[PDB]
Design a binder for this molecule. Structure first.
Ligand SMILES: Nc1ncnc2c1ncn2[C@@H]1O[C@H](COP(=O)(O)OP(=O)(O)NP(=O)(O)O)[C@@H](O)[C@H]1O
Ligand SMILES: CCCCCCCCCCCCCCCC(=O)O
Length: 539
């Protein structure tokens, strides 16, 4: 039924089986491993549960403000065990403070190394001392801050959808020696569902580390995935880029990547050229290319919406770019126009492309907003009726045959269907509209990112009633001419490959463009930093 009861059943079936292994790289750059069997993580969970029942009642929120590691896991699991709504946050910002005010927690779970409601340092609890839950709301997944309410029903449904789609070629049964491997942060939906929940729900073990460790030496990702068994992992697109760029072959001495079962690529636009570099670079170590699975979803859907066909490598389709910017997907020849990853229309949940101004499905090939319906779709945002209604209350006008009327999750993403596959253009609010045509930041950035090889951000800045293109461009500092080579180069490439004039090319130092913990650009941030003149230009 719930995560706590599934955790207890893991304990009955395999008390001494390994459950969680955390590889810490902070003191020893080669890694220090610490591991918990099912019994051991259950004991700690129960001790955390008892400490938390002293400060808070069933139904209260419990904020988790710990660094990545084993204590985070038993803080979250212990909150669920005691019937609290867990609120996974990062370790200290201002967001953290606004989430606490929104969630009004009756307890905080933290660690001594970082410090009204009672704060608990779970590492200073006697967690291994020897020796209830809700059936509905498990935790709030925070993005003004809005916390997605995730129920056990949401979780169970997405896992049925995920296990069915990911393991369709083996009859929805994962292999006996599957293990999970993740460096994604536990306070993001991908990292929480994969790293903390999935080991319990699937009945497999997890090998875990921090996003900070991965960004230091991206080879550690490949190394830990190559451990004994068939690895299941996930990462954003540019983490594929980074690993392809920074890993050294001697770090990969005698690594066998041919047992890796799945690496999801999701949480941002999946670029075929990144995927091609990753497979070209690492096919030498037997990385099977059917192991790579583009995956689309969002926190409002718990995590999963759609993925590539199991047992095949990613499928790429090509469309006319000018037609795309005009709102129409016109297929073209392999290598022409713009390339997009094919996503098979999922069986569960279901996807529709919908005109956001008329609440009516688009004809195939017409670009509109991606709408989602299914039991994995959350019931709303915590204590936000109005915003819940705006985001979760999609109602279809004159639904097509078999298509439910509602309620539909409005994803905020632009996309289209072609040949019973759908494609994702990008986030609507990040699109650059010039002369009635929509252009995608992800495509412009690829254009720049090939000449720069540094990071990018293509943003729209309103001025006197139109949108102007501005490009924040990271670049390596270690003369005045090359700088004007790059300016000339990037400006022309955008013009020749997009028909756009760049109003402003902001050449900055590496690390000036804001990025996620997983490393993804923040485009709405980039905008008002530009608008409040907060960027320093290499001139
Ligand atoms: N496979 C994918 N392809 C394209 N876009 C994706 C994919 N997976 C996730 N996304 C995008 O990430 C969004 C949800 O990520 P979420 O964590 O819920 O908020 P976010 O961090 O603001 N992501 P984003 O702004 O898109 O980079 C989805 O709406 C998509 O915009
Ligand atoms: C076998 C267990 C599978 C566990 C998978 C959990 C992670 C699933 C990720 C699916 C796509 C994620 C994209 C949505 C996240 C986001 O963008 O906010």
């Amino acid at each position: 039924l719930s995560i706590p009861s599934m955790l207890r059943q893991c304990v009955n079936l395999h008390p001494d089986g390994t459950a969680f292994t955390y590889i810490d790289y902070e003191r020893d750059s080669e890694g220090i491993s610490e591991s918990l069997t099912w019994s051991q993580v259950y004991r700690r969970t129960l001790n955390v549960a008892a400490e938390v029942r002293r400060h808070a009642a069933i139904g209260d929120r419990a904020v988790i403000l710990a660094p990545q590691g084993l204590d985070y896991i038993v803080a979250f699991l212990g909150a669920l065990q005691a019937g609290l709504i867990a609120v996974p946050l990062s370790a200290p910002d201002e967001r953290v403070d606004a989430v606490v005010r929104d969630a009004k927690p009756n307890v905080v779970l933290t660690t001594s190394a970082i410090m009204s409601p009672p704060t608990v340092a779970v590492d200073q609890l006697d967690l291994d001392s020897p020796i209830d839950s809700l059936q509905t709301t498990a935790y709030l997944q925070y993005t003004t801050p809005a916390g997605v309410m995730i129920t056990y029903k949401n979780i169970l449904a997405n896992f049925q959808q995920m296990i069915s789609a990911y393991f369709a070629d083996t009859g929805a049964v994962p292999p006996l020696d599957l293990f999970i491997m993740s460096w994604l942060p536990f306070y993001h939906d991908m990292g929480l569902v994969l790293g903390v929940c999935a080991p319990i729900i699937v009945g497999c073990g997890a090998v875990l580390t921090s996003p900070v460790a991965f960004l230091q030496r991206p080879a550690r990702w490949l190394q830990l995935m190559a451990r004994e068994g068939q690895a299941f992992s996930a990462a954003p697109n540019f983490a594929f880029e980074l690993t392809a760029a920074k890993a050294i072959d001697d770090d990969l001495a005698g690594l066998d990547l041919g047992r890796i079962k799945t690496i999801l690529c999701g949480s941002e636009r999946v670029h075929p050229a990144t995927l091609k570099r990753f497979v070209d670079r690492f096919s030498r170590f037997n990385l099977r290319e059917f192991a790579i699975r583009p995956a689309y979803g969002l926190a409002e859907a718990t995590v999963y919406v759609a993925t590539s066909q199991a047992g095949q490598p990613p499928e790429i389709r090509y469309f006319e770019p000018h037609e795309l910017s005009a709102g129409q997907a016109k297929p073209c020849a392999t290598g022409a126009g713009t390339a997009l990853v094919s996503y098979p229309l999922p069986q569960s949940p279901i996807v529709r492309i919908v005109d956001p101004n008329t609440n009516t499905e688009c004809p195939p090939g017409t670009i509109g907003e991606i709408w989602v319906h299914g039991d994995n779709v959350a019931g709303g945002y915590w204590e936000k009726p109005d915003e819940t209604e705006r985001t979760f209350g999609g109602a279809l006008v004159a639904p097509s045959a078999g298509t439910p009327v509602g309620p539909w999750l409005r994803t905020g993403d632009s996309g289209f269907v072609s040949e019973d596959k759908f494609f994702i253009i990008g986030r609507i609010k990040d699109l650059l509209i010039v002369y009635g045509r929509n252009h995608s930041p992800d495509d412009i950035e690829a254009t720049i990112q090939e000449i720069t090889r540094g990071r990018c951000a293509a943003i729209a800045v309103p001025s006197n009633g139109v949108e102007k293109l501005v490009a924040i461009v990271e670049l390596n500092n270690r003369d005045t001419e090359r700088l004007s080579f790059v300016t000339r180069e990037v400006t022309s490439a955008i013009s020749t490959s997009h028909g756009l004039s760049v109003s402003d090319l902001v050449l900055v130092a590496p690390g000036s463009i804001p990025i996620t913990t997983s490393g993804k650009v923040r485009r709405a941030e980039c905008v008002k930093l530009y608008r409040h003149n907060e960027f320093t230009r290499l001139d």
